[PDB]
Design a protein around this ligand. Structure first.
Ligand SMILES: [Mg+2]
Lengths: 275, 275
């Protein structure tokens, strides 16, 4: 294998947001062996890049659910975003539902203030804004703000109770042919430009490197990771993934709180040594 | 003539920052006659675009001294910026001089806190930051900040007393072949990527429209406007420009506090009617 692609949340990071020393040591070793290491994430580019900096990756990172692929923010390798007018229209529709909305731009994030009965929203790791490089604000009315401040969003994140996800998904897919809806988990959807995804972004990076998906190890933990797990040469589910995802993977490793990334890569190399 | 290009500061705007009703009326008339109206400015893109919105321009605007040409911020027609490493190195050199430095990014601006004996700095119109869309911050040490927060700047603005401009200009030009130094006035320099300028940006826009510089009316007021004044089919100096600029123009109009833009365009049309 020639390319290792890792989720950040639920894989690289422990549930307290720390990167374990064993994980750092495993990634350093992987790189020393000539394997290209990148991140494949729903996180905004800036958060992903600071993590990459900690791991000394110097790689094209696949961020904003595949909509933004870059090594340095001002000069992306691949970018796609929802038009400002479509973003406004989508926000108006979502405002009629009980859902928390976040426009996840690479330069800032803006969300509404609607409270939802969602525990995964409560569990999700919060990471810093920066008042210059990444302001994060909430407003009571997103669509009112967008009237005078249009936003062209690479990703719109939608948190809800599970009961209405199918309806929101149907309503958006039908009304907006320019976007796709990606189910992340029971309480979170990403709305992205049509054709954008983690697996599509990963394919673009592998192709750029002269590799195929056959040459890729992909490590994921949620529903939106399933396609890259199925399509990669070796698709790995973290121990903290739900049972369905674990059944669908080629390989199940330990959890993100038990250094499952390091554990899996140690075995990958033992396998190499045996062969 | 087919294309009207206007400065914002010192031309479109009165010295109190207001756009006079006569100016609005003149621009509406120009557009109704089929003439393409755009802005050519040292201002950051966002400030230029809000002004364009007020004038209902819907045009490609030439901003950041020609480094950023766009109708909508996320999707530029033309962009060039100084690399992050060159930006850092340039800032380090400038820090050894008595000068106020501002990194004029399209998403934010960051400057140092050095005080200079400069009245044109005192006179220059301040326009709003926005905590989401355009944060503006000052730090004691720009180069220290850039160590952990690299910036790839379309323009670096440098304010000084007049006595050291030549030395700074020489030092930068010699040390950084990837950039050009543009003298704006006796107390302000812009450092831009090589080949970037107001006149170059204007040429790119005219070419995109199937026009030549011959078809352009350009209205400017400072040293950095001289090339487009000389190169445009009709180059106009505002009344508030210094005498040298007024001598070099084809036509001198009234000042920005006496509606010189409106006054000049009224004559342009009287000329048309006579012909
Ligand atoms: Mg861009």
């Amino acid at each position: 294998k020639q390319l290792l692609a890792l989720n950040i949340d639920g894989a690289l990071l422990r549930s307290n947001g720390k990167i374990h020393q064993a994980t750092k040591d495993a990634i350093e070793y992987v790189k020393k062996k000539g394997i290209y290491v990148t991140l494949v994430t729903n996180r905004h580019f800036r958060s992903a890049q600071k993590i990459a900096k900690s791991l000394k990756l110097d790689a094209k990172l696949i961020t904003h659910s595949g909509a933004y692929i870059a090594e340095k923010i001002d000069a992306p390798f691949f970018e796609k975003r929802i038009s400002d007018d479509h973003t406004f229209n989508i926000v108006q529709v979502l405002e009629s539902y009980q859902c928390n909305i976040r426009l996840l731009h690479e330069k800032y994030s803006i969300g509404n203030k609607k409270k939802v009965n969602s525990n995964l929203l409560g569990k999700a790791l919060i990471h810093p804004s920066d008042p210059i490089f990444y302001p994060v604000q909430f407003v009571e009315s997103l669509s009112d703000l967008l009237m005078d401040e249009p936003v062209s969003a690479p990703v719109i994140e939608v948190y809800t109770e599970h009961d209405i996800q199918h309806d929101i998904t149907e309503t958006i897919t039908k009304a907006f042919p320019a976007v796709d809806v990606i189910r992340v988990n029971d309480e979170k959807l990403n709305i992205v430009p049509k054709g954008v995804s983690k697996e599509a972004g990963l394919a673009l990076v592998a192709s750029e490197l002269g590799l195929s998906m056959d040459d890729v190890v992909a490590i994921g933990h949620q529903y939106d990771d399933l396609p890259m797990i199925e399509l990669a040469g070796l698709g790995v589910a973290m121990g903290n993934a739900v049972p369905e995802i674990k059944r669908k993977a080629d390989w199940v490793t330990r959890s993100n709180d038990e250094q499952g990334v390091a554990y899996m890569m140690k075995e990958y190399f033992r396998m190499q040594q045996r062969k």
